[PDB]
């Protein structure tokens, strides 16, 4: 049994360009729990990102929160990059302040 990871990319507080914030990638509803998550900045992988502890829900599906600090700026592009057995190619979700 294999469940495909749902991904949400968002900021801790409402984004304002120039003012510091926190970037979050909430990966959930997946199985098996072996997963690889990386946050991206203009393509380059951002060093030292914090990981929460691998946990799960009532339906035994795993969830995990990867996060780091960032200052959103008009022309910067942040993303989340996820590898998992249910994904032939690593899925990438791009941050978007409208979501």
């Amino acid at each position: 049994i294999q469940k495909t990871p749902q991904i949400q990319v968002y900021s801790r507080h409402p984004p304002e360009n120039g003012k510091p914030n926190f970037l979050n990638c909430y990966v959930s509803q997946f199985h098996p729990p072996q997963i690889e998550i990386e946050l991206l900045k203009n393509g380059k992988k951002i060093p030292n990102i914090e990981m929460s502890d691998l946990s799960f829900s009532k339906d035994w599906s795993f969830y995990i929160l990867a996060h780091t600090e960032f200052t959103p700026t008009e022309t910067d592009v942040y993303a989340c990059r996820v590898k998992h057995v249910t994904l032939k190619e690593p899925k990438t979700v791009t941050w978007d302040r409208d979501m």
Binding site: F22, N24, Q34, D98
Partner: protein
């Protein structure tokens, strides 16, 4: 208004890399306070809440001891279940377990539980009577038989009625100004044009705790929930939660719609609209 202390265990055989990984996390309500990970530099029980950082070496040395005990039990169990299901040697399988207790306002044990699963499917589970077992398949029945003979259920309800209730009762004390809080949602509405020529109304809800919440878009009392767009509640990674829902609305009609927010922290439900 009940409270709860719960623990989550996970084991994964990882052929191709190394030995099985064991992870144990503890939750009081919707707040993790404790952690153990066998993929650490030197695995030991650690605090994940500011109100646990004064317990002292006594507690942490003892909790680590038990956590290591279960790390060893689990990599032994991983092999055992592979034999039950007659599976190949170098496979990658998962064993996860959850136990804990719900204790309600008065101090009474509302419900005790301990259930596990093999590769995302139910295995064996303690019944609510705290005396019997449910076995999902034949392999769990094997385990059940070994536990009914060993009278293992009795040792469980001992924990679930004693140690579990008491330590939960004192975990609440240590973090009372953080666990007994109720931060209400801070909602607002945003406007986003679509290529179709209509617009999207998105109602956010930010910085609330606990996580259970409800958002509903209205048209003067009438609902629009099965042509809506929800999003599952996500952690802001700071102890609070976020959520939003959206609807498509013809241009100009923006102010006509109101979103109803329902949460414990609020006196009475919110009704945010575009401004």
């Amino acid at each position: 208004g009940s409270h709860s202390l719960r623990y989550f265990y996970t084991a994964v055989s990882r052929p191709g890399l190394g030995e099985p990984r064991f992870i144990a996390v503890g939750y009081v309500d919707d707040t993790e306070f404790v952690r153990f990970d066998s993929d650490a530099e030197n695995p030991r029980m650690e605090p994940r809440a500011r109100w646990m950082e004064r317990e002292g070496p006594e507690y942490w040395e003892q909790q680590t001891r038990i956590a290591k005990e279960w790390e060893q039990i689990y990599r032994v169990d991983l092999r055992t279940l592979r034999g039950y299901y007659n599976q190949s040697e170098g496979g990658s399988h998962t064993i996860q377990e959850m136990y804990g207790c719900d204790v309600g306002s008065d101090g009474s044990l509302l419900r005790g539980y301990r259930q596990d699963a093999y590769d995302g499917r139910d295995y064996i589970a303690l019944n609510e009577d705290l005396k019997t077992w449910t076995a999902a398949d034949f392999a769990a029945q094997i385990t059940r038989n070994k536990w009914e003979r060993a009278r293992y259920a009795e040792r469980l309800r001992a924990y679930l009625e004693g140690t579990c209730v008491e330590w939960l009762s004192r975990y609440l004390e240590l973090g009372k100004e953080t666990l007994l809080r109720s931060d209400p949602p801070e909602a607002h509405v945003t406007l986003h044009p679509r290529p179709e020529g209509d617009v999207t109304l998105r109602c956010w809800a930010l910085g609330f705790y606990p996580a259970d919440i409800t958002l509903t878009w209205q048209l003067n009392g009438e609902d629009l929930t099965q042509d809506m767009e929800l999003v599952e509640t996500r952690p802001a990674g700071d102890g609070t939660f976020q959520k939003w829902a959206s609807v498509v609305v013809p241009l100009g009609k923006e102010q006509n719609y109101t979103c109803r927010v329902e949460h414990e922290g609020l006196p009475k439900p919110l009704s945010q609209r575009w401004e």
